[PDB]
């Protein structure tokens, strides 16, 4: 018998530093019912312990396992079968990108991995690069035939949002969890420690503010400081939610772990949004009016590269994200079965792939689009390119390298949700205040007339969007 | 056998119109199982048909009653143990009314009477009595004493909405709901009309606006008008929404009844709340500055009569919400019950309470508190006497005279929520402007400053009834 031949639909693999509690005992008493097979893994303090399951032994096999404590994780191995509909999925998309990709794609996915995570940013995915489609066309337009754009940038913004969070995630959520199968992920008060954070947050988000503008003067007093400093800046956030972010997570010592990493992720947000939004809307509104304002010469790179700067760091985060054989005698296909266990645990695209962090992308990505559109007309279309490619290196390194989390049957958004109705609004005034200034531009009124029009665009825009909603909703 | 001797658990009134048919051939073939009595009702063409119900006869007599669709109404009829019990508790909440109502007597009545609605109205007007106690005692503490008492209110208000909305409202829907008992009221494309509702709402609104305004200069020009225009407005009002708010909902021709309601009551709030908030708050910006904008003699009456006529509109709301015996030989309590009954089909009084009117009221009360406390220290005070005198004559009314719609045994807020929210929202930033400006009053600064601080109190008093919104649901 070989691990081949076994043809693992399941994997547990437990820590061999109790070898000589030999916890092996444990799982082969309990294997009278069902096969498996015994290999060391990777390193001296791991083995590998692959194990056929089925629906009739569903529960007991890991009632077992939850109490024994020790198992250090739980993988949903893809057998044959289904790593050979996987490939023919791949394959079918891969042919002809240039479509946007359809439901039934999707559908098919979803009833192969049976994945609520993946089917729901996959979904997002789709719905995205569909409805980027009409805006990136009228962006073409707009350009090469030459107030209209701006209205339509405000409406396409906000019948997004509300189409998304209102329409199709519904349904997308009652299909995830109506599957809802064996979550190895899950398996095996906060009033004070959480409003801490917004002061601690801003008080370092207005260093690197601050340390953004000390250094871009850097290179303007000197080509090798621009890489220099968005590298050091990513370094410094890195950094410092380290030694900030993990230690308020771990003293606010919330019961769930699912909720616990929805906060950290919170927290990584603030930062981040306050380090690459409010220097952009900053330096948009201070471009002109700093001028007549006699400052202390003055260029037009101050805000080009400036630009060029803070756009790179976001790529930047997209470039990062995109002797055993021998004692065992494993055959040409066990060794790439036990290759494949080895780059789950260990190899960083073997992991599971982070529904916060992928979303993370995509959000931010959204936010840069509405609310720097009205200045840059092509900007939709350089967006769908990018967001097409993403698509397919996504779609591949989630259905054959990243690490499965639910199991073939059943064994018994949130917060971005949120985020992307903020952006969509603040994307919204921003955009009619570019437009409310820019288009007789250096400022043709005083700042109590801007001011008063972006509060009026505000509320407007607030009540445009509940109107959205309350339509979708009777539906 | 008389009419007490049956002890009617149920009523049920049909159509005599058809004595032709003469349905009460049904209402006996279909009386088999369960003793009933027939007596002629207070007009020639209704009569009343008094029956016995128990759990076990529950479903197949209301089956049939709805296959027959000729019922005209239907009364779960209150016997003699249950009115007992019913003035027994009356009795006892009579005796000293000066404490706050207590949960033990609402759980008593709800255990009673297995209202949802009555139970929920009541549950609210407790609670807004409880939390209403302390601001007035604040502010009779502030007026004997004497931005202190501007932060208070900031804060009891914004404090008093979080918890109604994600404290006790909550709790209290799932209890109603769990009884969720037979509903005689329930039992026997949206955008399109609503929205053109609007217009013809600020049409009208400006309308009665400026017609409240010119009739208080016939009274200066001029005690008589002052009762004549309080009385017309309501009227006109009455008969606005008699020739429009009915119009719309019939064409808009909803399938639910409920909703229909609903919507008429948000129809015929619109134009109350334009009517009774904006001219409010366009005088109370306006009555100072005018004077430097050099009107057109300035005098007090303008302001003082204005907010008395405004004021006395409410209390008048308040104000007015606040042959057949002899041929069938009746008792003494046979007739005291056909009373009963003819009062609950004709008689104003013993029509079903209606949640929204009484919620509606309660809603008003609650807005001008709010957004006239600063000006008026000892509002709180008046308010709370006048809402323990309407409590006691609105849980008098409920339990004794007004329509039971909910059976002892099943047989098988909305909209106003918002309202609150949006009175709460709106009071809060009237108090906070209204104490920036009278401070020191005739204003010290330009119109530019009191808006910017307008909006930013706006925006953070949204930003504190989310934080309070967020530790509530938290729990």
Redesign the interface.
Same mark, same amino acid.
């Given at each position: 018998q070989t691990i081949t031949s076994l043809d693992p639909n399941c994997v547990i693999v437990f820590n061999k530093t109790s070898s000589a509690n030999e916890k092996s005992l444990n799982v082969e008493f309990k294997r009278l019912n069902i096969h498996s097979i015994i290999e060391p893994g990777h390193d001296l303090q791991t083995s590998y312990a692959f194990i056929r399951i089925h629906q009739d032994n569903a529960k007991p096999l890991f009632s077992f396992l939850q109490n024994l404590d020790f198992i250090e994780s739980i993988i949903p191995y893809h057998d044959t079968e289904l790593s050979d509909d996987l490939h023919k999925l791949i394959s079918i998309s891969k042919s002809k990108i240039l479509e946007a990709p359809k439901q039934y794609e999707l559908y098919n996915l979803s009833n192969l991995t049976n994945n609520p995570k993946q089917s729901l940013y996959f979904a997002f995915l789709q719905n995205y690069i569909k409805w980027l489609i009409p805006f990136s066309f009228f962006g073409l337009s707009i350009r090469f035939l030459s107030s209209t754009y701006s209205l339509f940038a405000i409406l396409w913004t906000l019948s997004f949002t509300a189409f998304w969070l209102y329409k199709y995630e519904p349904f997308w959520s009652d299909r995830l969890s109506k599957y809802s199968s064996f979550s190895t992920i899950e398996f095996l !008060?906060?009033?004070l420690k959480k409003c801490c954070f917004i002061p601690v947050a801003l008080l370092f988000g207005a260093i690197l503010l601050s340390f953004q503008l000390y250094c871009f003067a850097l290179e303007i007093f000197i080509f090798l400081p621009t890489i220099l400093i968005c590298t050091f800046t990513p370094v410094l956030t890195v950094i410092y939610n380290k030694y900030f972010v993990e230690p308020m997570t771990k003293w606010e010592n919330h019961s769930s772990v699912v909720n616990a990493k929805k906060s950290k992720e919170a927290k990584n947000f603030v930062i981040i949004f306050l380090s690459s939004y409010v220097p952009l809307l900053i330096t948009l509104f201070l471009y002109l009016p700093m001028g007549h304002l006699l400052t202390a010469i003055i260029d037009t790179k101050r805000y080009e590269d400036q630009f060029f700067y803070f756009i790179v760091i976001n790529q930047l985060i997209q470039f990062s994200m995109e002797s055993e054989i021998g004692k065992a005698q494993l055959s040409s296909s066990d060794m790439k079965i036990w290759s494949k266990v080895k780059s789950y645990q260990t190899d960083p695209w073997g992991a599971t792939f982070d529904l916060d962090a992928n979303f993370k992308k995509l959000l931010l990505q959204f936010g840069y689009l509405v609310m720097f559109s009205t200045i840059w007309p092509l900007a939709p279309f350089i967006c769908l390119i990018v967001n097409l490619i993403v698509y397919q290196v996504d779609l591949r390194k989630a259905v054959l390298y990243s690490k499965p989390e639910y199991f073939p049957f059943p064994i018994y958004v949130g917060l971005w949700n949120s985020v992307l109705v903020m952006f969509s609004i603040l994307g919204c005034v921003i955009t009619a205040t570019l437009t409310y200034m820019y288009q007789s531009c250096p400022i043709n009124h005083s700042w $109590?007339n801007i !001011? &008063?029009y972006a !509060?009026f665009i505000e509320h407007v825009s607030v009540a445009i969007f509940f &109107?959205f909603s @309350? $339509?979708l909703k @009777?539906s």
């Open positions: !008060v906060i009033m $109590i !001011v &008063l !509060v &109107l @309350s $339509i @009777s």
